[PDB]
Design a protein around this ligand. Structure first.
Ligand code: MG
Ligand code: MG
Lengths: 781, 133, 120, 68, 62
């Protein structure tokens, strides 16, 4: 094996910002690189648009304009030429540029402000696209990547991308089918779930069931493809049609691809446009809306390397090819899911029966506590109702966090007290057994169905364990799987840590007086690790959620099975002495024919059931195509349109007020700290401003210092429902609000929801506010 | 229908008759997490174990009190008005329907003491919303 | 009654079905969801006997039926009054089959007798 | 005229006092449970030996919803 | 911004005017704004219209 594409699974997120480098973001290539960066801009700013508009001037534009100043309200020929020089038609439709100059009568400044207005109307505060860079690495015998391909004069690389969307073709998502799949157990899912029927898989009917026959259902699949090479950096759109080909027919931009002269591919996702074929078809289910399409996609990334001597190298086989999937936006890029999709890859390689052979370092346990700690910026329960985060604050306040790194007997009660608050993914604690035919019924707090029964609830006898998030089995009141547990292999690390059977280096202890100090240390280990190919493989997936799956945010339950990977190998620790959950070489199973595969349009008839998944396990079976992905196969399970998924990915209220359960808050926040509050605690009393923290200078400085600091903390403590950062049907007199209006309005409002960004507090003083806060920006404020 | 009327701008949130039908209240659950001082000789102090509560610095203990004091809950959420449960619709109309039976379970605001606020910034008299207990 | 082709060719696959009133958990508490009653009548007395249960069971009385025996020994069974009701007036029956919080007075069960002749 | 037949239901002779009066299949029922119930020795065979309430339990609740 | 065809007009060589109405297209400014009232729906427009018909007659003598 000679050349390989990295990452093996790239991720690009939709946004309404433009598909150009200065105004777009890049999928992380190094884990934890950006956690405290207070300069991040995830929304398009006025400053970025102004700079873009300066860049488009002259070009001899000023003189070309000035020469008609002398020659004369414009003429068509005059406008047609002036607009041409700007080269702004790829951002805004040509006509609107013309209409903008037509309303005119220093002439450059009238031209600039008029053009700034049309750019601003289209893009100001827009959600920036998160694009994926793909790299070709030269490899060894044994396929170890050693360095990126360096093109010399006469060398060329050509990339090929073929993507599809099959959501409208596939089946309803009622729950994860693998919940009833017979198994010996993996690092991701205990065998108890299926064995004791804790959350039975449901059958699922076809989406758009009125379209009958396989031949006609092919119209429900949106697909496109394109090629770019290092000899031309022009961007190529990936554009399909729905329905595909008196049928009214829509163009669907599934993405855009770009290659630079060094040979790296940049993949942009679509604009986030979801639509029904009729305006009257509203998306009133969280996942399964007929007559709808969206611009999400996924597919196959291949390349061919042409060296100057004539040597040709095809990057086409599954061990060296790559995949790309597009997903909803990440509304808190610096807040990491507690369990990530990378953790699912790692857990899929492990058998539950072998988790006793796992070896544990503290750096394998720290991510759980650190991520849970940082959930405070997106979830109220983890800010004010999480006893583990409060204890971490206690330890930080006396610079005593390093005790958690002590594996000795004197610290065990400290370690065990924390460990005992976490939910066991065996799902066999806090249960009473009916008929010890068994049924395991939780004696902890259940999440009720909306379908009420006016009969007294059974009082809970055991405490609710961590984390306070719903899970795959939420449909089933009293199932232990209603609630999320860190997967078996991560719970094993935590159990080894509690028992003292873990190792840690002295250098880690010396950087561990507070959780943030150690988080910064581990961030530096990632930064300096020399395996850029595998770090970029991991960075693509560490921002993605890895559960619960109902269906999820970006991807869903097939990813937690080793069946979907053609390769999944442990290679090394991140650092020689520090594992940090490790680095892995993994690849998706791919159908090498892509869009031309005869299995492109397979299904299981009127319903899909776990029986079909059972049949698919044998790779020689007729159902094994389920795991050999063709384009569209990774994202077809997700909700259609995705905005319905996201609007349903929020809080699930229990009869008890607190803690409030939340689904996927790290990427779709539930409770956020608005900009409006940031501006009311950001300043110190000495600030040289006519307004300080929303008070007049005079009032701010007349009050006692402690009272000033108390007001800062009160403002810092005001968290706003994320669903309220845009108009989701609750605005106005007699507004109905409610869940369903959330689903309907999110189709248009997803791009106005608040975006969480790290920001500085220069002088917290004794207020208790950290020097870095995570602040939600929306135009609702 | 005597609650908040939201504007496109987040704040301030307009409220109709909050003095008699509250809109944002300080629940008992928060009161039990700021009413105690660090010197309390109890196995649980402000919702923390004795060991944790007394292990933290005084400044941090007082900050935790004030953060809890600052968590105000929508009064409409102090009983099940149609938003509870998986796929609950919630919304304005379900509020009207459920209030016919649920009015008697809505939170009731009552003055309560904070014996030793210290330097927390919490007043010696707070007004706390009690519901279902 | 049913051709093997329906199952053989997957013409109408069976669906999974969840529990009604799913918020009532544990078998012991779900026993409250069953309405039951019993009674006896004899040839010596034609007094009608109601079959009356309770929901939730051991609160509304549910008349599931009435039984009568005439002096000839024939049993007459009457069904209930057709009263269906939710435990809360606001719980409306918006689904063709599966409404939680509702009960009705439909029933079915076991009919037995003992014949006592004069010779003993 | 399509004939006359002698037929009888399978009955649990304990009726309301049967230990199978309150049996079920857990969180869902599926065709798998019915397949298992075909075997008269299975733990699911009670499905066919009716106790009171077993004939009408499948129907809609309330029946007026069925009728509409 | 939406184009609305309110009608079409034609005159023949005999001087008679023929007025056609629109295509009957009604639409909201947002697909989610549904017309759930018998007369008074905000955010909607339709292509009904009415207005003024005038003419000028020019004879050959001027
Ligand atoms: Mg995030
Ligand atoms: Mg009052």
């Amino acid at each position: 094996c000679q050349y390989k594409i990295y990452p093996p699974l790239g991720i690009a997120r939709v946004g309404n910002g433009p598909a150009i480098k200065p105004l777009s973001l890049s999928t992380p290539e190094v884990p934890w690189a950006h956690l405290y960066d207070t300069n991040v801009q995830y929304l398009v700013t006025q400053q970025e648009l102004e700079q873009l508009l300066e860049e488009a001037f002259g070009g001899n534009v000023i003189n070309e304009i000035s020469q008609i100043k002398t020659k004369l309200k414009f003429k068509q020929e005059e406008i047609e030429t002036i607009t041409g020089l700007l080269g702004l038609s790829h951002l805004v439709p040509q006509q609107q540029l013309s209409r903008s100059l037509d309303n005119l009568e220093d002439i450059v400044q009238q031209i600039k402000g008029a053009l700034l207005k049309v750019l601003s109307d289209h893009y100001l505060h827009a959600v920036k696209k998160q694009a994926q860079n793909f790299y070709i690495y030269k490899c060894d015998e044994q396929g170890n990547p050693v360095e990126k391909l360096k093109l010399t004069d006469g060398d060329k690389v050509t990339w090929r991308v073929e993507v599809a969307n099959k959501k409208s073709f596939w089946y309803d998502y009622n729950n994860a089918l693998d919940l009833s799949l017979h198994t010996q157990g993996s690092g991701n899912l205990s065998k108890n779930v299926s064995k004791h029927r804790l959350a039975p898989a449901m059958t699922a009917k076809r989406r758009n069931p009125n379209v009958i026959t396989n031949s006609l259902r092919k119209q429900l699949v949106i697909s496109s493809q394109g090629s770019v090479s290092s000899d031309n950096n022009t961007q190529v759109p990936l554009r399909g049609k729905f329905p595909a080909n008196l049928q009214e027919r829509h163009n669907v931009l599934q993405g855009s691809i770009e290659c630079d002269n060094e040979g790296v591919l940049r993949f942009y996702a679509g604009n986030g446009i979801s639509q029904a074929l009729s305006p009257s078809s509203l998306n009133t289910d969280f996942a399964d809306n007929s007559n709808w399409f969206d611009d999400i996609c996924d597919g196959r990334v291949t390349a061919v390397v042409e060296l100057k001597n004539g040597d040709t190298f095809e990057i086409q086989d599954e061990q060296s090819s790559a995949w790309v999937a597009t997903t909803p936006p990440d509304y808190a890029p610096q807040i990491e899911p507690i369990v990530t999709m990378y953790d699912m890859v790692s857990g899929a390689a492990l058998k539950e029966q072998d988790l006793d052979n796992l070896t544990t370092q503290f750096s394998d346990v720290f991510p759980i506590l650190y991520r849970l700690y940082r959930m405070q910026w997106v979830n109220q329960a983890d800010f004010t109702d999480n006893a583990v985060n409060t204890q971490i604050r206690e330890l930080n306040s006396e610079l005593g966090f390093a005790q958690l790194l002590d594996n000795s007997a004197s610290a065990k009660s400290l370690r065990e007290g924390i460990f005992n608050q976490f939910r066991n993914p065996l799902f066999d604690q806090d249960i009473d057994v009916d008929d010890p035919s068994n049924e395991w019924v939780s004696n902890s707090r259940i999440i009720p169905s909306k379908d009420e029964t006016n009969i007294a609830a059974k009082p809970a006898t055991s405490s609710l364990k961590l984390p306070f998030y719903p899970n795959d089995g939420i449909d089933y009141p009293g199932s232990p799987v209603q609630w999320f547990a860190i997967p078996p292999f991560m719970y094993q690390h935590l159990q080894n840590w509690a028992a003292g059977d873990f190792s840690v280096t002295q250098v880690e202890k010396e950087s561990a007086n507070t959780i943030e100090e150690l988080g910064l240390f581990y961030s530096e280990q990632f930064k300096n690790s020399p395996n850029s190919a595998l770090l970029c493989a991991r960075g693509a997936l560490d921002a993605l959620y890895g559960g619960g799956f109902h269906p999820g945010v970006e991807l869903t339950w097939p990813m937690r099975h080793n069946l979907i990977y053609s390769q999944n190998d442990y290679v090394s620790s991140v650092t020689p002495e520090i594992n940090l959950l490790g680095l892995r070489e993994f690849r998706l199973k791919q159908d090498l024919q892509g869009l031309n595969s005869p299995n492109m349009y397979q299904d299981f008839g009127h319903v899909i059931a776990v029986d079909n998944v059972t049949a698919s396990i044998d790779p020689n079976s007729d159902a094994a195509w389920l795991w050999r992905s063709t384009p569209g196969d990774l994202t077809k399970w997700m909700g259609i349109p995705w905005q319905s998924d996201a609007a349903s990915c929020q809080a699930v209220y229990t009869p008890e007020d607190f803690p409030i359960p939340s689904w996927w808050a790290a990427n779709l926040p539930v409770h956020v700290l608005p900009l409006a509050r940031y501006n009311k605690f950001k300043d110190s009393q000495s600030a040289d401003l006519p307004e300080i923290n929303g008070m007049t200078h005079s009032i701010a400085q007349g009050m006692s210092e402690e009272t000033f600091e108390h007001l800062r903390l009160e403002q810092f403590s005001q968290r706003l429902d994320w669903l309220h950062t845009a108009d989701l049907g609750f605005v106005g007199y007699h507004a109905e609000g409610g869940y369903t209006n959330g689903l309907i309005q999110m189709v248009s409002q997803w791009k106005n929801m608040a975006m969480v960004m790290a920001r500085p507090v220069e002088n917290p003083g004794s207020s208790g506010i950290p020097n870095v806060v995570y602040v939600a920006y929306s135009q609702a404020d």
